[PDB]
Amino acid sequence: QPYNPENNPVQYKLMEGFNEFVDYDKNESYLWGPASIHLVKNMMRSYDKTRWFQYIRGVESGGYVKNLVACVYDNKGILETKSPLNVLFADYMELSLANIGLIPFVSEKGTSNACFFSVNSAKKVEE
Amino acid sequence: EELQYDFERNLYDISSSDFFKKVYVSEFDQYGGEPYGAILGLYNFENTTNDIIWLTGMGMVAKNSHAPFIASIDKSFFGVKDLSEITHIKSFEALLEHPRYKEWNDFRNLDVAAYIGLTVGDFMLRQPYNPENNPVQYKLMEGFNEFVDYDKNESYLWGPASIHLVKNMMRSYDKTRWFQYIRGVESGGYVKNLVACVYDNKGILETKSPLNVLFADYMELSLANIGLIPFVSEKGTSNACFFSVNSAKKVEEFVDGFDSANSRLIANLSYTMCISRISHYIKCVIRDKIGSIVDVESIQKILSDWISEFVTTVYQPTPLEMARYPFRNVSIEVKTIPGKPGWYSCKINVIPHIQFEGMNTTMTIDTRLEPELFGTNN
Amino acid sequence: QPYNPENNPVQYKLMEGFNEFVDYDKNESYLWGPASIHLVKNMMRSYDKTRWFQYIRGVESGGYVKNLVACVYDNKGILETKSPLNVLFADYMELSLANIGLIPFVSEKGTSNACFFSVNSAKKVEEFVDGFDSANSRLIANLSYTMCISRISHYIKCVIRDKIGSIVDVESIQKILSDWISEFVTTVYQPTPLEMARYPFRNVSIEVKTIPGKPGWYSCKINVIPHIQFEGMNTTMTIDTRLEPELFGTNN
Amino acid sequence: AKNKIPNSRLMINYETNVDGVLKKKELPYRVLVVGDLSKGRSVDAKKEFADREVRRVNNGVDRVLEEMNISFDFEAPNFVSKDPSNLKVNYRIESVKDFRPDAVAKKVPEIRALLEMKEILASFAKDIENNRNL
């Protein structure tokens, strides 16, 4: 989360006043990271708890990824939240990607969370 | 700082932590040593990503040493410069959804957090010096009682509620024996006679409430969900009480009713204080018969014959006479393992007497209860 | 204990004033003795009282070693006591030594006492996959048993020497040797440790059998399972809330 | 004697030996507290953390304090005595009542100079001398 005083204040020192410190961003260009992390970071989870890798798909089962680093900002309104994910995949996007051989990291709107519905390789599915 | 550097250096190697080597392997682990119980952090912890480790480490110890680490949280937590202005926040439940607490929500999910118990509000521990109020006890000739101080709004010495919290756990031990007696008015936390304050600005000695903040009713609750211990005051009464005594552990929700209830009892600090007292029984007393010839059916005897005097279903009159019995019922299924002949592996499970926590109520004029007065046939 | 006037005064003579007599020590260098003494001095105890060597382990059972020669000294404070033992072993030290094949003489802090929790030989403990094999090596490393099994050798090569010329059989030697050891094997447990340590072994087999060629010669083969001692245990506490569903169940 | 007395015809001995497992005294529920008390000014505080003997408070917070050499040499505005140099409060804490605005005036040498006059100056018998009555 970018650095604001009222939001995500830089932890200053015990005397050096620093918490009053802003950053400079607006639209979409302030640090990102690939979904692959949470994907693997769930395979790890799907091993300490269970033992195999069935527990990395769907909401109720595997990929849920709780509590992500969202973002909020006060441009003119009243702290309009910013979804943690790069892109807000719809339903048929979740599927129409699985056929291409991609793993979509779809978000629940507002919930500030995600889930892996599809976990397909790049291998062709044929018919 | 001398602990900040300690845990932050040995977070991934706690057994080598210097402090850990002055509470676990020092007095709790060693033979003739006297173990500790319920540490008391006199500090104030913010939402910083440094002070978050401090708890992560101290809890890493407490978890193992079995000693619920109680502390307090600064007003800097809620992102406000005056703790009194926390009353303005509607629901802290919706607050923690803010991405500013992301690091914190991760910590609440850790297992170690089930031993941390953070308190909100600070009691006034000293009355400032006036001649007509709290006069300095002068000497037998050196006139000194005529001596004033200089304060007004809100800046004259405070102390964290955590003290009275622990100072009630002590009380809930000399009187009773376990830690059921630290909640509610009638039962535990009442904290009688606090150091209030009075001052004559222009009116006629307008009293000042002993507590930092005058929590309302739904504040008492809307904090318990965040994993905080509010030290709420009775307006004017110059007293307090702990309604909630929850750890920082997440409460979850779940679909299955049983699972939902599990997480509600685990978050509850008062039980983990009690369950901890069993660990101080096992790794303490059974050490005596470490070489004696015993069996699966013998260890289930010694360990059960003890705890049996502390489990009931019947309720005794008054709270104190019943808080003698913390638990409701217990299972103790020990069993030998293959390979190691002299080794075993126990697995107990305790259901503590579930405390009251609140209730809804729908009143209504039925007029159907007694049909003899409103029925057709007459 | 080193010699001070107020502490451990030298017993002077009936006129020669000598009790006022000091020594010179401070940190850690004033006479020591190996723990092995008390170890053996407990095996002796575990013989006059009981008869075998089960009574040399643990607090409640064997090794307790009451009343040791501590030390006190007034440097500047007020007689700061000095623990009788060389080293103040912690809990996992008691164990983490037993695996190396050592016998730690651990002390109770302040109590001015000790106890032998572990009594293992220097034999390797191994591990193995098969559970039985793994347990074998755990009992063999244990010194207290090899002390007992040894006492059977002191029975055979000692007593059966009497009937060296007598006419006996495969079925007769299995009698004399068994009828003896039989009074020391049980399964039931007696109250208190001492009253039960009378019985070291759990059960025994004794299959002797004559060999071809040598007519008057035999070849025995016994096998003893000693009463396995306590050694430790893990424990997982948890709030189940599923034990009594009458309070948390749906139906209400 | 291990040699053992020669057995007579009627040897009575009287057994006085008793076996049994010793008792264990209860454990006082210890409460550890951890906070910056000395601010880095005490015998056990000035030492490395690897070796800080925990206190006990057997007596009370009055004597467990005095057991620690908690002094302080912090400067403060001067309004007593002559010459320059700000007032230097320098004394070790004995009891907890030391922070009482009174025990301070008894401890700080400079302030005690004014309190010393209030014993003599204010004790002027202008009521015994003024009350003459013939």
mmCIF file of C-alpha atoms in Angstrom, chain B residues 62-222:
data_model
loop_
_atom_site.group_PDB
_atom_site.id
_atom_site.type_symbol
_atom_site.label_atom_id
_atom_site.label_comp_id
_atom_site.label_asym_id
_atom_site.label_seq_id
_atom_site.Cartn_x
_atom_site.Cartn_y
_atom_site.Cartn_z
ATOM 1 C CA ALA B 62 4.122 -17.668 26.422
ATOM 2 C CA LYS B 63 2.680 -20.339 24.149
ATOM 3 C CA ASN B 64 5.402 -22.769 25.214
ATOM 4 C CA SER B 65 6.105 -21.597 28.757
ATOM 5 C CA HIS B 66 2.315 -21.567 29.228
ATOM 6 C CA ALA B 67 1.933 -18.046 30.566
ATOM 7 C CA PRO B 68 -0.727 -15.784 28.957
ATOM 8 C CA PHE B 69 1.050 -12.540 28.077
ATOM 9 C CA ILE B 70 -1.216 -9.619 29.009
ATOM 10 C CA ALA B 71 -0.480 -6.117 27.707
ATOM 11 C CA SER B 72 -2.024 -2.826 26.571
ATOM 12 C CA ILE B 73 -2.475 -1.046 23.241
ATOM 13 C CA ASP B 74 -1.762 2.609 22.528
ATOM 14 C CA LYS B 75 -4.335 5.046 21.190
ATOM 15 C CA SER B 76 -2.187 5.064 18.032
ATOM 16 C CA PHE B 77 -3.782 1.742 17.136
ATOM 17 C CA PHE B 78 -7.144 3.122 16.047
ATOM 18 C CA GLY B 79 -5.316 5.918 14.228
ATOM 19 C CA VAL B 80 -6.419 8.616 16.674
ATOM 20 C CA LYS B 81 -4.400 11.063 18.779
ATOM 21 C CA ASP B 82 -6.826 11.072 21.712
ATOM 22 C CA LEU B 83 -8.134 7.809 23.115
ATOM 23 C CA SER B 84 -11.333 9.514 24.231
ATOM 24 C CA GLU B 85 -12.142 10.004 20.535
ATOM 25 C CA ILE B 86 -12.468 6.259 19.978
ATOM 26 C CA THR B 87 -16.076 6.633 21.087
ATOM 27 C CA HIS B 88 -16.764 8.379 17.762
ATOM 28 C CA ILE B 89 -15.984 5.228 15.775
ATOM 29 C CA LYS B 90 -19.187 3.341 15.078
ATOM 30 C CA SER B 91 -17.983 -0.249 14.786
ATOM 31 C CA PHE B 92 -14.383 -1.409 15.034
ATOM 32 C CA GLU B 93 -15.488 -4.534 13.213
ATOM 33 C CA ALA B 94 -15.754 -2.520 9.990
ATOM 34 C CA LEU B 95 -12.550 -0.695 10.934
ATOM 35 C CA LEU B 96 -10.276 -3.731 10.775
ATOM 36 C CA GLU B 97 -11.482 -4.358 7.221
ATOM 37 C CA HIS B 98 -9.456 -1.254 6.303
ATOM 38 C CA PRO B 99 -6.177 -2.271 4.547
ATOM 39 C CA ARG B 100 -4.178 -0.410 7.177
ATOM 40 C CA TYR B 101 -4.607 -3.387 9.515
ATOM 41 C CA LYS B 102 -3.536 -6.033 7.014
ATOM 42 C CA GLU B 103 -0.398 -6.906 8.957
ATOM 43 C CA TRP B 104 -2.453 -7.083 12.145
ATOM 44 C CA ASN B 105 -5.138 -9.388 10.766
ATOM 45 C CA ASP B 106 -2.368 -11.813 9.817
ATOM 46 C CA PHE B 107 -1.100 -11.867 13.401
ATOM 47 C CA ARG B 108 -4.575 -12.563 14.780
ATOM 48 C CA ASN B 109 -4.527 -15.766 12.747
ATOM 49 C CA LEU B 110 -1.335 -17.071 14.376
ATOM 50 C CA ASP B 111 -1.634 -19.706 17.090
ATOM 51 C CA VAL B 112 0.545 -17.733 19.491
ATOM 52 C CA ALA B 113 -2.031 -14.933 19.511
ATOM 53 C CA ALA B 114 -4.290 -17.163 21.618
ATOM 54 C CA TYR B 115 -2.108 -16.195 24.593
ATOM 55 C CA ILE B 116 -1.844 -12.462 24.016
ATOM 56 C CA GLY B 117 -4.557 -10.404 25.721
ATOM 57 C CA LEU B 118 -4.483 -6.698 24.943
ATOM 58 C CA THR B 119 -6.301 -4.119 27.069
ATOM 59 C CA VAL B 120 -7.877 -0.779 26.132
ATOM 60 C CA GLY B 121 -8.215 2.242 28.391
ATOM 61 C CA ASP B 122 -5.843 3.557 31.035
ATOM 62 C CA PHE B 123 -6.768 4.185 34.663
ATOM 63 C CA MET B 124 -5.640 7.301 36.465
ATOM 64 C CA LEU B 125 -2.988 6.143 38.940
ATOM 65 C CA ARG B 126 -2.209 9.425 40.656
ATOM 66 C CA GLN B 127 -4.282 12.413 41.621
ATOM 67 C CA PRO B 128 -2.479 15.706 40.899
ATOM 68 C CA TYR B 129 -1.481 17.831 43.901
ATOM 69 C CA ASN B 130 -3.889 20.427 45.286
ATOM 70 C CA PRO B 131 -4.054 21.856 48.808
ATOM 71 C CA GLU B 132 -7.778 21.190 49.258
ATOM 72 C CA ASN B 133 -7.519 17.951 47.260
ATOM 73 C CA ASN B 134 -4.765 15.373 47.752
ATOM 74 C CA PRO B 135 -2.461 17.594 49.855
ATOM 75 C CA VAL B 136 1.216 16.646 49.945
ATOM 76 C CA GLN B 137 1.910 15.165 53.356
ATOM 77 C CA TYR B 138 4.308 17.798 54.673
ATOM 78 C CA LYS B 139 6.702 17.395 57.597
ATOM 79 C CA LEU B 140 6.097 17.969 61.326
ATOM 80 C CA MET B 141 7.250 21.602 61.030
ATOM 81 C CA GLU B 142 8.154 22.341 57.400
ATOM 82 C CA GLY B 143 4.910 23.811 56.080
ATOM 83 C CA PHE B 144 4.431 22.165 52.700
ATOM 84 C CA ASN B 145 0.769 21.113 52.488
ATOM 85 C CA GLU B 146 0.040 24.419 50.757
ATOM 86 C CA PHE B 147 1.389 23.219 47.424
ATOM 87 C CA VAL B 148 -0.259 23.088 44.000
ATOM 88 C CA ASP B 149 0.471 21.425 40.652
ATOM 89 C CA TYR B 150 -0.308 22.422 37.033
ATOM 90 C CA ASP B 151 -2.732 20.495 34.819
ATOM 91 C CA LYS B 152 -6.131 20.934 33.139
ATOM 92 C CA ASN B 153 -7.503 18.903 30.210
ATOM 93 C CA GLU B 154 -5.965 15.420 29.876
ATOM 94 C CA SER B 155 -2.247 14.996 30.592
ATOM 95 C CA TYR B 156 -1.437 14.022 34.177
ATOM 96 C CA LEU B 157 -0.109 10.467 34.501
ATOM 97 C CA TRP B 158 -1.796 7.278 33.339
ATOM 98 C CA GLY B 159 -1.380 3.531 33.686
ATOM 99 C CA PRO B 160 -2.482 0.600 31.499
ATOM 100 C CA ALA B 161 -5.619 -1.391 32.388
ATOM 101 C CA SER B 162 -3.559 -4.542 32.062
ATOM 102 C CA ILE B 163 -2.495 -4.066 35.686
ATOM 103 C CA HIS B 164 -5.962 -4.451 37.157
ATOM 104 C CA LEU B 165 -6.535 -7.261 34.726
ATOM 105 C CA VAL B 166 -3.617 -9.259 36.119
ATOM 106 C CA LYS B 167 -4.293 -7.921 39.608
ATOM 107 C CA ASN B 168 -7.651 -9.691 39.275
ATOM 108 C CA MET B 169 -6.137 -12.941 38.048
ATOM 109 C CA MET B 170 -4.171 -12.904 41.291
ATOM 110 C CA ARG B 171 -7.407 -12.248 43.163
ATOM 111 C CA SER B 172 -8.985 -15.012 41.117
ATOM 112 C CA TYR B 173 -6.563 -17.458 42.664
ATOM 113 C CA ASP B 174 -6.223 -16.642 46.335
ATOM 114 C CA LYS B 175 -10.009 -16.714 46.684
ATOM 115 C CA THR B 176 -11.008 -19.319 44.124
ATOM 116 C CA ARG B 177 -8.242 -21.363 42.482
ATOM 117 C CA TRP B 178 -8.810 -21.031 38.726
ATOM 118 C CA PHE B 179 -9.521 -18.131 36.374
ATOM 119 C CA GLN B 180 -13.289 -17.958 35.938
ATOM 120 C CA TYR B 181 -13.421 -15.115 38.428
ATOM 121 C CA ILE B 182 -12.072 -12.374 36.126
ATOM 122 C CA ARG B 183 -15.147 -11.450 34.097
ATOM 123 C CA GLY B 184 -18.388 -9.567 34.604
ATOM 124 C CA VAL B 185 -19.624 -7.518 37.528
ATOM 125 C CA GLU B 186 -21.192 -10.101 39.793
ATOM 126 C CA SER B 187 -18.431 -12.623 39.080
ATOM 127 C CA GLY B 188 -14.904 -11.400 38.375
ATOM 128 C CA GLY B 189 -13.663 -8.029 37.207
ATOM 129 C CA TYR B 190 -15.188 -5.274 39.304
ATOM 130 C CA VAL B 191 -12.109 -3.339 40.448
ATOM 131 C CA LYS B 192 -13.445 -1.428 43.433
ATOM 132 C CA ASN B 193 -12.289 2.052 44.455
ATOM 133 C CA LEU B 194 -10.193 3.769 41.773
ATOM 134 C CA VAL B 195 -8.159 6.961 41.944
ATOM 135 C CA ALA B 196 -10.547 9.510 40.468
ATOM 136 C CA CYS B 197 -9.912 13.254 40.340
ATOM 137 C CA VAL B 198 -11.745 16.461 41.221
ATOM 138 C CA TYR B 199 -11.037 20.081 40.332
ATOM 139 C CA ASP B 200 -12.492 23.544 40.873
ATOM 140 C CA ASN B 201 -12.117 25.541 37.656
ATOM 141 C CA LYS B 202 -15.114 27.846 38.122
ATOM 142 C CA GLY B 203 -18.024 25.598 39.097
ATOM 143 C CA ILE B 204 -18.077 23.479 42.252
ATOM 144 C CA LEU B 205 -15.564 20.609 42.143
ATOM 145 C CA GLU B 206 -16.479 18.936 38.852
ATOM 146 C CA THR B 207 -15.379 15.310 39.228
ATOM 147 C CA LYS B 208 -13.197 13.592 36.620
ATOM 148 C CA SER B 209 -13.892 9.963 35.709
ATOM 149 C CA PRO B 210 -11.036 7.631 36.758
ATOM 150 C CA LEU B 211 -10.923 5.960 33.348
ATOM 151 C CA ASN B 212 -9.372 7.304 30.176
ATOM 152 C CA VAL B 213 -12.455 6.556 28.103
ATOM 153 C CA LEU B 214 -16.137 6.064 28.921
ATOM 154 C CA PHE B 215 -16.988 3.026 26.809
ATOM 155 C CA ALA B 216 -20.650 2.567 25.995
ATOM 156 C CA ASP B 217 -22.396 -0.802 25.861
ATOM 157 C CA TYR B 218 -21.873 -1.849 22.248
ATOM 158 C CA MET B 219 -18.269 -0.691 22.609
ATOM 159 C CA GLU B 220 -17.767 -3.424 25.222
ATOM 160 C CA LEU B 221 -18.755 -5.920 22.562
ATOM 161 C CA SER B 222 -17.519 -4.301 19.357
#
